Amino acid sequence: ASATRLIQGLRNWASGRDLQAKLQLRYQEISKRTQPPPKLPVGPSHRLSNNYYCAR
Amino acid sequence: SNLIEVFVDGQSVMVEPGTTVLQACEKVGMQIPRFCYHERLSVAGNCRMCLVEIEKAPKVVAACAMPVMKGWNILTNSEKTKKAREGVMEFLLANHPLDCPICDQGGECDLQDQSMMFGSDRSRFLEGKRAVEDKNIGPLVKTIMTRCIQCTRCIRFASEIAGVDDLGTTGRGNDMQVGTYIEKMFMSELSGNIIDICPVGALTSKPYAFTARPWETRKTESIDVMDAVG
């Protein structure tokens, strides 16, 4: 953004690509950093009572 | 004539009477994991690690101290063999403190090598692990009483070879302490030869204590000096 409409018309007139739409200026699409911290669980183990190392 | 047929996983070998399961397995090439046995010390069945399964045997025995009858067959890769060893390994590593950095036998442990090659991985017993106060056994041997797995190898060594006989066990059950009751220092001959015998890093060297680490030192043959025995 922050451009005049005449040079936007020239950018569309140069090639049919619609440069206003996707423009290689990532503004706020990046997720806002320092979210609340997410937990990292454990999958097919760490349940008790069966998980022998003799088996797997 | 004193040549006894035992089968290691099916393969025959002749074994003298009185010699154990373990000397048969050392004859064929096997080893059994063990703590309270030592090949040049006395024999008792304390540490329970050396359990093994015989074909047609509903009673799992400790292979360190078994008189060998004629015609056995020994499973060293079976199901409940590994189950019993992993169980005992989860037992031994409960009252042992998280000291493997600050231990001096970190490169040359035994709990570590057997817990890799024979142990489980996802532990239990979320709360506990009491600790024991130390006392200096002397100026030459640094002593932490906490890492003692109570294997009773130093004690029988003292009782049968050293003859000083000041190192026993006190208390019962969980609360068993090893070493000295009357707080008397141990300054006799071969007092440095207990750092090679203690299979965990409990009784370690005082002057050596924190100057190296075993995986960084290259070794060289040498001959004993200031003696005549070498």
Ligand code: SF4
């Ligand atoms: S003796 Fe105990 S503290 Fe030392 S390396 Fe082995 S398990 Fe760790």
Ligand code: SF4
């Ligand atoms: S001090 Fe070492 S050799 Fe003695 S019983 Fe304890 S672990 Fe075994």
Ligand code: FES
């Ligand atoms: S070696 Fe057989 S029980 Fe310790």
